[PDB]
Amino acid sequence: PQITLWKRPLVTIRIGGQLKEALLDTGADDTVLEEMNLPGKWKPKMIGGIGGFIKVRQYDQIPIEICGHKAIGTVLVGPTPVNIIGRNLLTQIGCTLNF
Amino acid sequence: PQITLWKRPLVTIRIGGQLKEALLDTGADDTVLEEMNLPGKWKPKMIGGIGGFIKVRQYDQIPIEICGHKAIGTVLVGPTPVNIIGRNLLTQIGCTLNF
Numbered sequence: 001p002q003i004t005l006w007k008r009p010l011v012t013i014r015i016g017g018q019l020k021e022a023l024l025d026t027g028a029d030d031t032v033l034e035e036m037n038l039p040g041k042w043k044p045k046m047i048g049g050i051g052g053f054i055k056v057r058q059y060d061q062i063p064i065e066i067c068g069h070k071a072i073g074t075v076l077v078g079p080t081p082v083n084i085i086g087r088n089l090l091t092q093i094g095c096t097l098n099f
Numbered sequence: 100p101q102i103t104l105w106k107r108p109l110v111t112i113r114i115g116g117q118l119k120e121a122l123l124d125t126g127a128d129d130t131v132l133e134e135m136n137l138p139g140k141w142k143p144k145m146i147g148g149i150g151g152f153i154k155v156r157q158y159d160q161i162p163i164e165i166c167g168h169k170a171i172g173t174v175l176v177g178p179t180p181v182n183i184i185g186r187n188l189l190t191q192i193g194c195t196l197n198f
């Protein structure tokens with residue numbers, strides 16, 4: 001689809017059978033989701049945003065369906081203000097910026 | 100133009116006599132620029148991202164040139180590591196997300 005930007009680009013995602021709202025975020029390298037349980041091994045990581053650094057858990061090769069488009073990749077889980085879909089998964093679903 | 104997201108969507112912006120690189124950021128409600136001493140009235144504001152909040156100065160009706168597209172609007176100035184072009188200006192230059 002085409003998404004305009006007068007409102008936040010919030011979309012429904014499906015992960016682990018669960019539906020969540022997430023923000024299509026071209027200013028994020030990486031996808032970061034709010035606290036949740038995912039299976040498998042994770043690696044502790046730190047990431048730094050506009051307000052400082054947080055600790056997250058890195059899960060690799062996680063299937064997510066974003067607005068009906070399948071992705072399989074890395075998801076960071078931690079105290080992000082909002083679920084954000086970053087470029088690692090935006091590239092997978094063929095998302096581009098256009099003007 | 101079409102901008103793929105294999106790399107950070109950095110473009111050149113112009114604000115007065117300053118040329119800077121900025122992210123076309125669909126995850127950003129507002130435009131946030133690194134520290135600079137713009138003329139005219141401003142108001143203090145707090146904005147939150149990953150890691151918490153920072154204090155910014157809100158300037159209204161500031162002209163900004165983004166890839167030779169004219170914009171004018173609110174710009175928040177503060178201690179960000181990266182210049183961020185938010186949705187308030189992204190819509191003025193006709194920017195959409197597409198997949």
Ligand SMILES: CC[C@H](C)CN(C[C@@H](O)[C@H](Cc1ccccc1)NC(=O)[C@@H](O)C(C)C)S(=O)(=O)c1ccc2ncsc2c1
Pocket residue numbers: 023025026027028029030047048049050051081082084124126127128129130131146147148149180181183185
């Ligand atoms: C809420 C979702 C999101 C976390 C908001 N942020 C935009 C997001 O694209 C920011 C943009 C950014 C990039 C580099 C350095 C700092 C910030 N990205 C990120 O926070 C993550 O990718 C970090 C790992 C950097 S932001 O913190 O930069 C931001 C940007 C604009 C804005 N306007 C009103 S509140 C507000 C917050």
